[PDB]
């Protein structure tokens, strides 16, 4: 019925995420011409998205449909920790890939002196460690639930839900640590890159189109449409009274989950230097 | 098989040295091909720093290596295929001598349309601008004798002449550049571009000009790589 | 008097052509028409030798068929171990513009050269466990295209100054200069008896020379453009040439004329490397269109394509025992096929 | 007068190419065929060797 | 063997015309870009004209535009240079050197001192 149709639509995103990320991981690891340091950010981001689409997204798929968690409080906390970890890691990887294109475009004559294996490994280690520590020290310590425990009990715990709950300070912290700080950097980088590429294209046409819009249009719009609806609503939840229905909250969650499905496409298949290496087989 | 383990370890350390040399080499260091004729002041391009030369200089802590091949014969078609991975070709042209300017144009055309140098962006250096200005001001030799299209030519609206520059001098130098740009834009496609510069034997901004065009070349290469251009 | 000399040269050429036509009783193509085709041969990349950081412009197989030396524009001369992909040595070159390299038949010496006009001999069997410049051979006024070892004492090189030279490594001087080419000499090949060697040049002509006496014996013509590669047929009484006209020509020292034509309307790029396999039945030729086709020398047709390189196949050499063939290229990889 | 010297050198070179005896092209092709047939079994590239003897497996 | 033999030239008064004829045998004439190279007595070789494989990319040096015209006959494997309205500055030896490789739009080396694929040449004298 409706539940089956939703399950099929959601398993579509599950399969898209899994297959798209396996393709990227296998292509980067196996093919050896795609071993530049900038391709390790893509590999790590694909690993993050695969882990999300294999651990959380399939597990939250039944949670959204049934509107009830029946796996215990401990595993509910573990699931929320892994979700926050992997989502923040993916957003951090987007920010660091954007920093890599900023280094490649803005400062071209020192690109290999700034983006090398050591720097890429440092970026990957940060992108994995910081969300992990943040989530597992915020929700296991109940920092997010602190201050609204009594309200949360009746609102979610009495209903047996596993929906993350954020207080006034905790919601702002989650916003500033998963959307604004790792998204304002990306927006600034792509805005600067858009102006630079527009200037270069105009100069080239002067000496002799605008393709910096079909690239930076999707690379920004996918992220915005998939994350902004969730984060702007979640940060306003403490400041509005928690009136948003669970169904719309689930839709906001699965926008962010669809971001992990669209990331492998946008960041690998849009670029011909990846498709050419993929088409050899 | 202990010898096999020893050989494998030696191969690993050798590969480690190769990778270290690769990082320390291909990082803030760019290779350039300094090409020109005997009359052209190719040697006296950058004032600040038996078969092939090598000039090394830095501008913004970025190393540049110019390779001046000055010991082979006049047949250039085979030894020039080695320089198809350089950042740019520093083509130096003597603007004053119009008699050999046509063969300079032919050399530029062959380099531009070469099947291997078709991705290398030429950094054109119109050298001896002072001598060109003196020649055109004296008027003893006329450019329309060696090019029967300079008469039907006007200076471009985008020209930026020196304040102390004669309009005829500006027209002449910009006619030579446009003659080079014509070859450049006839079959330039979008993978390589010509960067013309009017330089003298006294100007010390050749290194900065090379730095800026290499930055532009690499930036456009990266934009094409990330499909932003 | 100059007109008389020109007339003498023209009549000598006419006599040579008439002798060639008279000796052309039949055509090798129709004589070999009775040979059954081998069929499409499949050869796959067995080894991919990565580690070079720039274009690979030349390589040479060892006589042991185990160790191969490769030269790259980055400035390294790696002596690989094809069986185990182990880099036995990685020689740093003073000049990174190396265009050729040879591995001595003994195995204790390796040469390289290029835009530095210098053939640098490297000792791989020193008692101190290192690699050092044994001798800096100088005297060529053009880039070195191909150098080959007669032994640990004599090495013959080809330069871009239209001349080939025979060197004594210990002496360091040109024993004999092989003059007569008009264009840049682009390749070398030594007969199995090492008494004769041919060298294709950038004049659509291949010249047969005698190492002992030091004068040209047979000048071969029949190509439409610059010859880029040349190798002897394993019998030693024939040789093949690859040129920019996208055509390979096989000649005979005895017949002194072109025999066959290895070209197709589908190949447009020129040849950069030619090498018979072990019996002169296979003629592997490396083209600029990123793959090196395999041509049946006897059937004078194409019977295989070796694709897999991302750039120009600059160098192509076969093992002395016929067990493998290596194809270096500008993509910084040597692929060994079998 | 280097031009006449080069012309005379080319004349001598062509003469000493001409006086060289040349066998029949049919004989040369037959010899090449015989060599290839004799060494056909010894060419691993012509006929692939079993993987046991192949050192690049 | 590649061969490039020129027929034409001689002594002509200023303003005269001469149709130089270069016969090129041995190679596929219809497949190579073809040039005309002239060497003034006491000067280095100078490229004076050019054509394409078919004959649509014709280009000239400045000193002869509007005075010389180049034409190629693919079937006859012959190429011409109608040097009409010749001036005293046109006294030189004219070569019909082809280009090093076919299928290419670059003729990288045709005015070299010892180019392999030049013809013998015809001394054109004008007085
Ligand atoms: C709960 C939370 C965060 F605090 C930060 C990022 C992501 C999430 C969840 C909800 O939305 C998605 N896709 N994961």
XYZ file of N, CA and C and ligand atoms in Angstrom, chain A residues 83-84 87-88 164 166 174 178 227 230-231 253 256-257, ligand 1:
56
model
N 24.533 8.425 12.470
C 23.910 9.348 11.484
C 24.610 10.697 11.557
N 24.673 11.302 12.740
C 25.278 12.627 12.842
C 26.731 12.587 12.390
N 26.822 12.176 8.444
C 26.341 13.366 7.749
C 27.331 14.516 7.874
N 27.824 14.772 9.089
C 28.808 15.830 9.261
C 30.102 15.512 8.526
N 16.164 12.407 16.655
C 17.043 13.275 17.453
C 16.350 14.545 17.925
N 16.946 18.323 19.824
C 17.990 19.327 20.132
C 17.405 20.488 20.934
N 24.658 22.393 16.664
C 24.586 21.459 15.547
C 24.548 22.198 14.218
N 27.547 21.715 11.498
C 27.290 20.838 10.367
C 26.755 21.532 9.121
N 20.098 19.799 2.108
C 20.438 20.015 3.511
C 19.755 21.220 4.139
N 16.349 20.673 6.023
C 16.469 20.011 7.315
C 17.064 20.937 8.367
N 18.174 21.604 8.039
C 18.923 22.326 9.062
C 18.222 23.610 9.484
N 14.895 14.795 6.839
C 15.990 13.852 7.044
C 16.388 13.185 5.733
N 18.576 15.170 3.283
C 19.982 14.998 3.600
C 20.518 13.631 3.243
N 19.677 12.612 3.277
C 20.145 11.256 2.900
C 20.275 11.185 1.385
C 20.411 14.705 13.474
C 21.406 15.227 12.441
C 22.396 16.305 12.846
F 22.384 16.792 14.119
C 23.406 16.847 11.841
C 23.421 16.300 10.411
C 22.419 15.215 10.010
C 21.414 14.678 11.021
C 20.428 13.587 10.580
C 19.089 14.182 10.237
O 19.167 14.505 8.843
C 20.072 13.578 8.283
N 20.186 13.266 6.874
N 20.867 12.999 9.365
